[PDB]
Amino acid sequence: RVKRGVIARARHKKILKQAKGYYGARSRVYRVAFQAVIKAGQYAYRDRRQRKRQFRQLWIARINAAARQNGISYSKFINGLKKASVEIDRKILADIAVFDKVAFTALVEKAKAAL
Amino acid sequence: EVTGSGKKPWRQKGTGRARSGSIKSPIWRSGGVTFAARPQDHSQKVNKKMYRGALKSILSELVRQDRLIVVEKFSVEAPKTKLLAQKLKDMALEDVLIITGELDENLFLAARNLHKVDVRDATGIDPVSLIAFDKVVMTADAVKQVEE
RNA sequence: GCCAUUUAAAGUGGUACGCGAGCUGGGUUUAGAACGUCGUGAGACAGUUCGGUCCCUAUCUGCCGUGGGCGGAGAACUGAG
RNA sequence: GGCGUAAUGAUGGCCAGGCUGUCUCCACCCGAGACUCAGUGAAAUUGAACUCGCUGUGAAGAUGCAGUGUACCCGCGGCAA
RNA sequence: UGUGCAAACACGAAAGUGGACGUAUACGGUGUGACGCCUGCCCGGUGCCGGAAGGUUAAUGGGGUUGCAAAGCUCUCGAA
RNA sequence: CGACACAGGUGGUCAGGUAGAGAAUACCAGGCGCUUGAGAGAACUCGGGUGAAGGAACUAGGCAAAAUGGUGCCGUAACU
RNA sequence: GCGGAAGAUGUACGGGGCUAAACCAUGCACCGAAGCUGCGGCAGCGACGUUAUGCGUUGUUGGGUAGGGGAGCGUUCUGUAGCCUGCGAAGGUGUGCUGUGAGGCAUGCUGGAGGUAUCAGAAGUGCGAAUGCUGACAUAAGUAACGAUAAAGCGGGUGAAAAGCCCGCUCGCCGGAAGACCAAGGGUUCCUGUCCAACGUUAAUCGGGGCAGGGUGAGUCGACCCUAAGGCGAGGCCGAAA
RNA sequence: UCAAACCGGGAGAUAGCUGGUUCUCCCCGAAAGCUAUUUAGGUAGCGCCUCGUGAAUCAUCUCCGGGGGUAGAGCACUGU
RNA sequence: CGUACACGGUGGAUGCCCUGGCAGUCAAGGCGAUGAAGGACGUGCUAAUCUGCGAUAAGCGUCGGUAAGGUGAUAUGAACCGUUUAACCGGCGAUUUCCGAAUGGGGAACCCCGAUCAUUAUCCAAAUGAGGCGAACCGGGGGAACUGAAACAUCUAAGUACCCCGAGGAAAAGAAAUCAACCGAGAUUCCCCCAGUAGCGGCGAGCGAACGGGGAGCAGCCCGAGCCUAAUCAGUGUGUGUGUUGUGGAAGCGUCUGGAAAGGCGCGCGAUACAGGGUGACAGCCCCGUACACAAUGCACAUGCUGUAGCUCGAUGAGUAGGGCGGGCCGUGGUACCUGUCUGAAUAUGGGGGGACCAUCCUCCAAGGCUAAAUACUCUGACUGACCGAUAGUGAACCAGUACCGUGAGGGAAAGGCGAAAAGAACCCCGGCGAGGGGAGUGAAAAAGAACCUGAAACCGUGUACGUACAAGCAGUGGGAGGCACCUUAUGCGUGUUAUGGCGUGCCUUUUGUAUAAUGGGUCAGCGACUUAUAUUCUGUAGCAAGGUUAACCGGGGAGCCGAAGGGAAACCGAGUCUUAACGGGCGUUAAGUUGCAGGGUAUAGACCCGAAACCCGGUGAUCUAGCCAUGGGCAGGUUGAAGG
């Protein structure tokens, strides 16, 4: 009796339409959805965030690569940046001492000094 | 009442059958509700005193200033409807159409057209007609009949 | 397993006791019947015996062979493995 | 019901003569086709992905687990794991 | 093996009916099942049938007890 | 008739049309071509016709196949 | 540490490879968890204050199948207030924005007739997973199949087309039979003319196909009539009666 | 269609038998014993999830006042 | 060939509409041997269906109404009729072939007659009845099972299903040898209550009244005689309240959009008449219709009246009451009712009854009979419905109970809509071609062309964006590099898509464990699975408060129920009560509940859906086949060759 309405036949859509990176099926069909996207929302339910503290392997494992060229490295390279000056955080840093033959030394001579 | 064995040959089990319509059978539209307590359809956790008590409290809502007003019995006589709109205008309560309307004796037809008017008699007036959207208006004989 | 005539030798074990979408069916677990045993009995008895059906135009994959193209083509050759 | 028994019985087992592929092993041919071409044109059958190989492991013989290596595309025919 | 028949035997709730448009050199109910040789030991334990001292075998009526009635208890007498 | 223009099933009469041992093959009369096509000398069956030598050795069983298999004369056992 | 130790299409610790880039006895610094600590955003329970389960502060802070509890939005119709619309709505497609979400909302195209918000009540209310029910559809396949009455062929005619419509010749099949006459049954399917969209497992100017007409004129043919096994109705007799 | 007809009818027969049972999010988060029940893959009073009410001060991870006698040990019934 | 989209198609969902259903309500209610219902078959110039009739065949006649238009649904061609006023609407009359329950007899519609039973009987069928049909309801008889008792033989389902006979529009019952709180009630049914009490029951499960009270409706009378006339009977006249149709009936207004408004916007109006429909798109004030008015018919239930006709006296029904035996049935208990066999009274100076038997009170008197009124269903007519909407709803809004299936009983679909009108594809080209369309035309809001509104998904074709014949697989995410393509969301800000690299074993139940060689699904949409009375026990909210709430039926009631003091077997007491000479103890007590709507749960009852074989009843069938019977037909011929003579 009650005409289905904007529910069902309105559910096949509003879904399937969001997978800009769909697959063969899992987008053309619905029975392939709500099971392919069910993994979505989860699988990494609230984890992308993994990268941070994950791929961050470098930036703290390249800092020595930046150094070990104009003196010591990692060991007493970060144990000097917090000694003098305002002490700059290590984010954009330890990532710039690779894509530019400059600034990387603007931290080595900073360190090794006032040690 | 069960049907027992007989009638038409075919393996079938005990199932609610009312006018060839299934009921009281949990696994069928309008069937037994195993999880009892709430034998009906979605209402609200809720009367003997709220329904009736209100049926009384409402009758008291009339004796309030910012409310309705009692009209003489001659009101039921008015055959036309325009006369009502007038008696409601001069009454300074033409905005009562924005409310509703009632009376006594028989159903006052001559007002069943006026804005918001669910005609009803003082005899059987559930809290409903008593005040459409917490507001109303009645007549003389009506009040007396409602008193009891 | 009785056994016969030969054989210089004429071992053994696994492959879901390899192998029935390859075969054969002769055997066992159907409708008849015969027999013993059990039963009063129908009938019964992983007791026996005579007669008794075992299917499919493989799509994919694998392998055995044969070709078309791709690295511009005809002809003649070489050739790791 | 025991014993035994002419003629007959598409009944069960067995031996001889003659003969025969039934077998030890097997060539082609004939009719109607298969392979290709015009026209006419269904029905069965599929969770997804899918070209693996060598070892190891696993209920100790899985392509799909683990470690490496490797893997050109398509198509025709078969015997079919 | 049963039966001379309004029989045995069988069918139907009943009314009626099959076998009888028959009748025992009949018909119904069964075993064996040909032909040939045949054919020996026991009835202690079923079914059917016949006879049968004694034992077993209801209720009514009858007798005794019980109770100014009645329950109840009990005796006696018993076809096929 | 069988769901269909399904090689299934379905009564009677014509059994002297011509050649032989006959209502058997070939052939007048009569009827019909209404049981999808075209090209190439594979592997690959079902149907089919038998093989040099041996010959059932196959096999549950010679299943299958084959063989004797017209007519006339001679001759013909056990058993009953 | 070793002898006691033979078997399966190419053999090695994950590999390279390492006298330690092994192993054994220890130790230190790092990478490395959604771990621990720090910055911006929670839940449940309990405590304090409170009418409050509203806030503020405080202790514990946050994995989960079966199962328990709770919130939620899509939805229809009928209240009361109050609006939008052919300077165009609902619905549909694509897209932007917002909410933890369930969703709301906007734009463009289209549609082109009505459709909502607040508070309130309501409904047979919101759904991918019964060898589920019904209809439709894809891949599979343009793959499988057409076989004792195995006969057609060479010219010609007609036609816009003719390998199977028609003519001639030649070549064959059947003969108790595909011949002739009939029962049952089927039933006009018979004949003529005009056509073919539909039927004929190809095509067809052909048809037992489609359409329109015509055809089956008996006293002696058959029906009609009667009867056999047998059956029925009426009277007679049985709770009652078909 | 028969170790038992077909159709419809009194069946949406009865089953301690199988399967089935579809929207989002948040919090917490098992067990496999006893008595009785036509009861044992079922409930009720109870061992265990959750919610409301009621009462009231321990409990136990500790300590303190009792009961058991197993491992082990020693050496011990009995029988070697 | 992967994926997205674009244009077109397939398909048909969806949105809207719907001349249909479903449900409720009021009114009304039988037909026929003067041969009906139903069916068969005719009939219109053409008509194949449906409907109407029926051979004066979708028609004839009269009266009344009505009206110019008409000749059914199909708006076609031809053509007719009407003012000698038709069509149409209502009533009535005439006619009404043959067959047909027909019954003379036979018979699958065809041929010849009152057949059969029965009454009266001038016994001549001469005069009459029965023999059929019809939705349910009603009365009198016969009478299960599965099932429940989670076994089952009582019991339960049942006195139901089904069967036999019969009446009416209504039946059955009934005037008390009753009831039995009483110096009382007092015909019988039905509704409510009394009771879920008394009672019954392996007293297990379950089963289950009545008296009375409150209502609806009220009516009492007849069988021997005497006498005389208003009960009754026979007959006559003959209604008030009506049925259908037509008459007295107001009303396009303005602007804008459009082909057209029943649009938007502005204004006004009807209402003892605030249903709905139609008219070119949502008009209560356009048309019909709704309240209303009038005339044609049927019914006329009743009453009036004529002739009959009061009234009076006595009595009152034996194989019955009752008893015994064997059963059925009931709530029926030794104390219901009825059937069958046997036995068998008295008699009102008598007898029966008051739920046990027998003597003593009260009531009432059988063994004869009749009797109005008070509810049912729903074919038919009308109305309504917060019902459904054409895979919805009745199977049927389209030929439907039709297509079609089965020997038969029986079973049983699908198919809606162009629009203002008509269009529904003219003309031209191509081609073998009325079977493949460019083009073009049709259009409104037909993002229209013969199953035509809108018109999605699965899906197909072309085309576009982008990968793509070394390529490893959930096919993401974050970081950093590449290019290409687009700048209707200008801002170092994004998309389509992709090369390469680091990771990554569909979804759903069963199970201790399932990604798993456990089970289910090819995909899609729709469909598809937790309710209607009451009773009991708790919980959340709220009014009021030892008072509270009613039920039938009335805005009135308070019956009755629960609570207020309890406890006990009871008597009985009372601060309870059991135990108890007595005493002493056990348990309970100084004020809150009741009445609904909801939320936990519980019992009686089709109370989890679908899913396997049985059982029982009434019917349909042996053109298959099995056996028998009746009537016909068939068996080239050969071989061997007895008895007998």
XYZ file of N, CA, C and O (backbone and C1' of nucleotides) in Angstrom, chain D residues 9-74:
462
model
P 12.289 -77.187 -27.069
O 12.298 -76.332 -25.723
C 11.184 -75.516 -25.366
C 11.374 -74.949 -23.979
C 12.650 -74.150 -23.766
O 12.446 -72.789 -24.134
C 12.366 -75.695 -21.992
P 12.947 -72.267 -25.570
O 14.063 -71.183 -25.231
C 15.203 -71.023 -26.071
C 15.947 -69.759 -25.710
C 16.214 -69.561 -24.230
O 17.376 -70.280 -23.834
C 15.406 -67.544 -25.176
P 17.251 -71.447 -22.738
O 17.803 -70.787 -21.399
C 17.172 -69.644 -20.828
C 17.125 -69.781 -19.325
C 18.452 -70.141 -18.677
O 19.231 -68.978 -18.422
C 16.784 -71.612 -17.893
P 20.798 -68.978 -18.785
O 21.483 -69.729 -17.559
C 21.681 -69.064 -16.316
C 22.387 -69.974 -15.338
C 23.693 -70.583 -15.820
O 24.789 -69.693 -15.644
C 22.357 -72.272 -14.865
P 26.035 -69.756 -16.660
O 26.809 -71.087 -16.247
C 27.569 -71.144 -15.044
C 28.231 -72.496 -14.895
C 29.109 -72.953 -16.048
O 30.417 -72.399 -15.962
C 27.706 -74.731 -15.370
P 31.337 -72.323 -17.280
O 31.656 -73.847 -17.622
C 32.476 -74.635 -16.762
C 32.508 -76.070 -17.234
C 32.979 -76.298 -18.662
O 34.401 -76.358 -18.730
C 30.998 -77.528 -18.286
P 35.150 -75.972 -20.101
O 35.131 -77.321 -20.952
C 35.979 -78.414 -20.610
C 35.715 -79.589 -21.524
C 35.877 -79.327 -23.013
O 37.230 -79.477 -23.430
C 33.822 -80.416 -22.639
P 37.699 -78.881 -24.847
O 37.056 -79.869 -25.921
C 37.543 -81.200 -26.072
C 36.827 -81.903 -27.204
C 36.871 -81.217 -28.562
O 38.073 -81.511 -29.263
C 34.659 -81.898 -28.105
P 38.557 -80.541 -30.451
O 37.517 -80.812 -31.628
C 37.584 -82.011 -32.395
C 36.558 -81.988 -33.508
C 36.590 -80.781 -34.432
O 37.566 -80.939 -35.456
C 34.356 -81.244 -33.806
P 38.224 -79.640 -36.137
O 36.991 -78.877 -36.798
C 36.422 -79.328 -38.025
C 35.267 -78.438 -38.423
C 35.580 -76.953 -38.508
O 36.112 -76.610 -39.783
C 33.622 -77.262 -37.229
P 37.100 -75.349 -39.921
O 36.188 -74.097 -39.546
C 35.105 -73.703 -40.385
C 34.298 -72.612 -39.723
C 35.071 -71.368 -39.314
O 35.201 -70.460 -40.404
C 33.726 -72.075 -37.509
P 36.411 -69.385 -40.452
O 35.940 -68.195 -39.504
C 34.801 -67.404 -39.836
C 34.240 -66.740 -38.599
C 35.178 -65.796 -37.862
O 35.144 -64.486 -38.420
C 34.194 -67.275 -36.311
P 36.413 -63.518 -38.246
O 35.863 -62.296 -37.382
C 35.234 -62.509 -36.118
C 35.954 -61.729 -35.041
C 36.192 -60.261 -35.370
O 35.139 -59.377 -34.963
C 38.200 -61.259 -34.587
P 33.879 -59.924 -34.119
O 34.504 -60.286 -32.696
C 34.025 -59.653 -31.510
C 34.812 -60.108 -30.300
C 36.314 -59.873 -30.324
O 36.629 -58.551 -29.894
C 35.863 -62.071 -29.567
P 38.071 -57.920 -30.230
O 39.106 -58.898 -29.515
C 39.237 -58.915 -28.095
C 40.355 -59.846 -27.681
C 41.718 -59.547 -28.286
O 42.411 -58.562 -27.527
C 41.248 -61.849 -28.520
P 43.537 -57.659 -28.235
O 44.763 -58.655 -28.440
C 45.537 -59.095 -27.327
C 46.714 -59.917 -27.798
C 47.616 -59.251 -28.826
O 48.573 -58.432 -28.158
C 47.114 -61.468 -29.505
P 49.596 -57.530 -29.010
O 48.672 -56.690 -29.998
C 49.067 -55.387 -30.426
C 48.349 -55.014 -31.702
C 46.845 -55.204 -31.659
O 46.225 -54.029 -31.136
C 47.770 -55.964 -33.743
P 46.323 -52.613 -31.928
O 46.972 -52.901 -33.364
C 46.687 -52.039 -34.486
C 46.923 -52.760 -35.807
C 46.235 -52.150 -37.029
O 47.027 -51.134 -37.654
C 45.743 -54.464 -36.925
P 46.306 -49.878 -38.364
O 46.007 -50.365 -39.855
C 47.078 -50.681 -40.741
C 46.629 -50.619 -42.189
C 45.986 -49.338 -42.693
O 46.922 -48.303 -42.959
C 44.857 -51.207 -43.603
P 46.384 -46.843 -43.376
O 45.577 -47.105 -44.726
C 44.470 -46.283 -45.106
C 43.650 -46.975 -46.174
C 42.397 -46.250 -46.651
O 42.674 -45.290 -47.665
C 41.843 -48.483 -46.160
P 41.557 -44.194 -48.049
O 40.298 -45.057 -48.510
C 40.319 -45.774 -49.743
C 39.075 -46.627 -49.891
C 37.737 -45.910 -49.878
O 37.431 -45.343 -51.146
C 37.603 -47.846 -48.531
P 36.317 -44.189 -51.249
O 34.960 -44.928 -50.857
C 34.297 -45.775 -51.792
C 32.917 -46.139 -51.291
C 32.065 -44.986 -50.788
O 31.439 -44.292 -51.860
C 31.912 -46.805 -49.282
P 31.020 -42.751 -51.669
O 29.701 -42.820 -50.779
C 28.477 -43.301 -51.327
C 27.432 -43.429 -50.245
C 27.190 -42.183 -49.411
O 26.269 -41.309 -50.056
C 27.442 -44.043 -47.980
P 26.536 -39.723 -50.045
O 26.141 -39.270 -48.570
C 24.777 -39.199 -48.165
C 24.681 -39.059 -46.664
C 25.429 -37.880 -46.060
O 24.643 -36.694 -46.085
C 25.969 -39.836 -44.861
P 25.368 -35.258 -46.126
O 26.278 -35.243 -44.818
C 27.272 -34.237 -44.630
C 27.793 -34.276 -43.212
C 28.983 -33.375 -42.917
O 28.554 -32.058 -42.582
C 29.341 -35.530 -41.985
P 29.599 -30.836 -42.637
O 30.635 -31.139 -41.462
C 30.224 -31.136 -40.096
C 31.263 -31.819 -39.237
C 32.633 -31.155 -39.201
O 32.675 -30.193 -38.149
C 32.873 -33.476 -39.634
P 33.546 -28.852 -38.317
O 35.003 -29.367 -38.698
C 36.163 -28.729 -38.168
C 36.960 -28.097 -39.283
C 36.240 -27.000 -40.055
O 36.426 -25.733 -39.430
C 37.124 -28.570 -41.577
P 35.261 -24.627 -39.504
O 35.370 -24.036 -40.980
C 36.451 -23.182 -41.352
C 36.360 -22.837 -42.820
C 35.059 -22.182 -43.261
O 35.120 -20.769 -43.092
C 35.551 -23.988 -44.700
P 33.775 -19.942 -42.787
O 33.027 -19.879 -44.194
C 33.503 -19.037 -45.241
C 32.609 -19.155 -46.454
C 31.136 -18.860 -46.215
O 30.856 -17.469 -46.306
C 31.330 -20.909 -47.353
P 29.531 -16.880 -45.611
O 28.362 -17.241 -46.631
C 28.202 -16.507 -47.841
C 26.806 -16.686 -48.391
C 25.664 -16.467 -47.412
O 25.364 -15.087 -47.248
C 25.253 -18.418 -48.681
P 24.729 -14.573 -45.863
O 23.325 -15.322 -45.783
C 22.282 -15.011 -46.702
C 21.099 -15.928 -46.490
C 20.538 -15.992 -45.080
O 19.654 -14.907 -44.822
C 20.721 -18.179 -45.957
P 19.346 -14.477 -43.303
O 18.579 -15.732 -42.694
C 17.312 -16.133 -43.208
C 16.842 -17.396 -42.525
C 16.782 -17.341 -41.008
O 15.557 -16.756 -40.576
C 17.818 -19.357 -41.695
P 15.527 -15.871 -39.234
O 15.665 -16.942 -38.064
C 16.198 -16.573 -36.797
C 16.730 -17.792 -36.083
C 17.547 -17.506 -34.834
O 16.694 -17.377 -33.698
C 18.726 -19.016 -36.222
P 17.199 -16.559 -32.409
O 18.043 -17.629 -31.586
C 17.860 -17.787 -30.179
C 17.035 -19.022 -29.899
C 17.032 -19.519 -28.460
O 16.063 -18.848 -27.662
C 17.453 -21.330 -29.911
P 16.343 -18.621 -26.092
O 16.650 -20.080 -25.526
C 15.602 -21.030 -25.339
C 16.168 -22.365 -24.905
C 16.963 -22.374 -23.607
O 16.113 -22.519 -22.472
C 18.189 -23.503 -25.271
P 16.718 -22.322 -20.994
O 17.655 -23.595 -20.782
C 18.630 -23.627 -19.739
C 19.583 -24.781 -19.948
C 20.812 -24.796 -19.049
O 20.532 -25.457 -17.816
C 21.467 -25.132 -21.300
P 20.983 -24.791 -16.418
O 22.539 -25.134 -16.331
C 23.403 -24.359 -15.501
C 24.742 -24.164 -16.172
C 25.431 -22.856 -15.812
O 26.261 -23.025 -14.664
C 25.325 -23.089 -18.168
P 25.857 -22.322 -13.274
O 26.904 -21.130 -13.115
C 28.284 -21.387 -12.867
C 29.081 -20.109 -12.990
C 28.637 -18.978 -12.075
O 29.293 -19.062 -10.813
C 28.803 -18.176 -14.294
P 28.451 -18.858 -9.458
O 28.938 -17.448 -8.896
C 27.992 -16.441 -8.543
C 28.675 -15.296 -7.830
C 29.914 -14.731 -8.501
O 29.560 -13.804 -9.522
C 30.293 -14.972 -6.172
P 30.548 -13.575 -10.767
O 31.783 -12.788 -10.140
C 31.641 -11.441 -9.697
C 32.924 -10.967 -9.056
C 34.174 -11.136 -9.904
O 34.344 -10.033 -10.789
C 34.579 -11.977 -7.736
P 35.180 -10.226 -12.149
O 36.683 -10.401 -11.652
C 37.369 -9.330 -11.011
C 38.686 -9.814 -10.451
C 39.600 -10.516 -11.442
O 40.376 -9.578 -12.180
C 39.454 -11.798 -9.463
P 40.773 -9.900 -13.704
O 41.595 -11.261 -13.609
C 42.834 -11.320 -12.911
C 43.276 -12.754 -12.744
C 43.364 -13.566 -14.027
O 44.611 -13.360 -14.677
C 42.198 -14.809 -12.391
P 44.748 -13.661 -16.249
O 45.722 -14.921 -16.313
C 45.484 -15.990 -17.223
C 46.722 -16.844 -17.355
C 47.317 -17.316 -16.037
O 46.699 -18.525 -15.604
C 49.023 -16.386 -17.385
P 46.637 -18.867 -14.034
O 48.139 -18.668 -13.545
C 48.890 -19.755 -13.011
C 50.282 -19.757 -13.598
C 51.284 -20.682 -12.925
O 51.190 -22.007 -13.437
C 52.252 -18.544 -13.219
P 51.685 -23.244 -12.539
O 53.267 -23.066 -12.476
C 54.074 -23.302 -13.626
C 55.522 -22.995 -13.322
C 56.102 -23.698 -12.106
O 56.561 -25.003 -12.439
C 56.661 -21.403 -12.028
P 56.699 -26.115 -11.288
O 57.890 -25.579 -10.375
C 59.235 -25.592 -10.849
C 60.179 -25.166 -9.749
C 60.034 -25.914 -8.434
O 60.775 -27.130 -8.461
C 60.153 -23.586 -8.017
P 60.508 -28.247 -7.337
O 61.103 -27.598 -6.009
C 60.602 -27.960 -4.727
C 61.072 -26.969 -3.688
C 60.452 -27.125 -2.309
O 61.153 -28.094 -1.538
C 60.336 -24.861 -2.967
P 60.361 -28.969 -0.450
O 59.910 -27.905 0.646
C 60.872 -27.258 1.473
C 60.213 -26.171 2.289
C 59.003 -26.599 3.104
O 59.399 -27.157 4.351
C 58.502 -24.606 1.935
P 58.443 -28.221 5.086
O 57.175 -27.363 5.524
C 57.304 -26.288 6.452
C 56.030 -25.477 6.492
C 54.764 -26.259 6.804
O 54.584 -26.393 8.209
C 54.392 -24.879 4.923
P 53.748 -27.637 8.790
O 52.257 -27.362 8.299
C 51.496 -26.283 8.836
C 50.176 -26.163 8.113
C 49.345 -27.436 8.060
O 48.544 -27.558 9.232
C 49.459 -26.472 5.901
P 48.592 -28.912 10.096
O 47.789 -29.971 9.219
C 48.107 -31.359 9.284
C 47.069 -32.175 8.549
C 46.720 -31.700 7.149
O 47.664 -32.200 6.212
C 44.742 -32.265 8.334
P 48.521 -31.177 5.317
O 49.467 -32.140 4.473
C 50.766 -31.726 4.059
C 51.768 -32.815 4.352
C 51.293 -34.211 3.990
O 51.538 -34.491 2.618
C 52.169 -34.223 6.185
P 50.299 -34.633 1.605
O 49.971 -33.133 1.177
C 48.905 -32.856 0.273
C 49.453 -32.595 -1.109
C 48.464 -32.839 -2.239
O 47.778 -31.631 -2.558
C 50.538 -33.932 -2.688
P 46.503 -31.171 -1.691
O 46.064 -29.804 -2.382
C 46.978 -29.074 -3.201
C 46.396 -27.728 -3.561
C 47.274 -26.836 -4.427
O 47.134 -27.234 -5.797
C 46.490 -25.603 -2.568
P 47.018 -26.136 -6.974
O 47.894 -24.893 -6.500
C 49.064 -24.509 -7.220
C 48.902 -23.117 -7.792
C 48.374 -22.066 -6.833
O 49.414 -21.556 -6.010
C 47.259 -21.874 -8.913
P 49.152 -21.346 -4.441
O 48.018 -20.229 -4.392
C 48.350 -18.857 -4.565
C 47.180 -17.977 -4.193
C 46.486 -18.291 -2.880
O 47.261 -17.902 -1.740
C 44.857 -17.960 -4.552
P 47.418 -16.351 -1.338
O 48.163 -16.412 0.067
C 47.426 -16.286 1.280
C 48.084 -17.079 2.383
C 49.570 -16.828 2.569
O 49.790 -15.666 3.357
C 49.153 -19.155 2.591
P 50.914 -14.610 2.912
O 52.281 -15.402 3.111
C 52.878 -15.507 4.398
C 54.230 -16.168 4.295
C 55.151 -15.614 3.224
O 55.824 -14.449 3.686
C 55.175 -17.978 3.149
P 56.389 -13.385 2.624
O 57.672 -14.106 2.016
C 58.785 -14.427 2.843
C 59.807 -15.219 2.062
C 60.223 -14.611 0.732
O 61.238 -13.632 0.924
C 59.775 -16.920 0.451
P 61.520 -12.543 -0.221
O 62.403 -13.333 -1.284
C 62.390 -12.973 -2.661
C 62.830 -14.145 -3.505
C 62.671 -13.967 -5.006
O 63.798 -13.299 -5.562
C 61.750 -16.045 -4.362
P 63.600 -12.310 -6.814
O 63.343 -13.291 -8.042
C 64.353 -14.198 -8.476
C 63.748 -15.287 -9.329
C 62.978 -14.816 -10.555
O 63.853 -14.607 -11.659
C 61.684 -16.404 -9.377
P 63.464 -13.535 -12.794
O 62.209 -14.184 -13.532
C 62.270 -15.509 -14.054
C 60.876 -16.036 -14.305
C 60.045 -15.253 -15.310
O 60.305 -15.720 -16.631
C 58.768 -15.634 -13.354
P 60.031 -14.726 -17.900
O 58.452 -14.779 -18.118
C 57.764 -16.025 -18.221
C 56.289 -15.822 -17.962
C 55.596 -14.858 -18.915
O 55.083 -15.562 -20.047
C 55.114 -14.247 -16.677
P 55.817 -15.439 -21.474
O 55.153 -14.167 -22.168
C 55.000 -12.941 -21.460
C 54.283 -11.918 -22.314
C 53.018 -12.386 -23.008
O 51.906 -12.351 -22.121
C 54.329 -11.094 -24.503
P 50.598 -13.223 -22.453
O 49.939 -12.467 -23.690
C 49.314 -11.199 -23.517
C 48.520 -10.833 -24.746
C 47.583 -11.906 -25.268
O 46.355 -11.900 -24.550
C 48.793 -10.964 -27.070
P 45.469 -13.236 -24.479
O 44.936 -13.412 -25.968
C 44.115 -12.414 -26.566
C 43.947 -12.688 -28.041
C 43.487 -14.089 -28.398
O 42.076 -14.211 -28.277
C 45.287 -13.470 -29.799
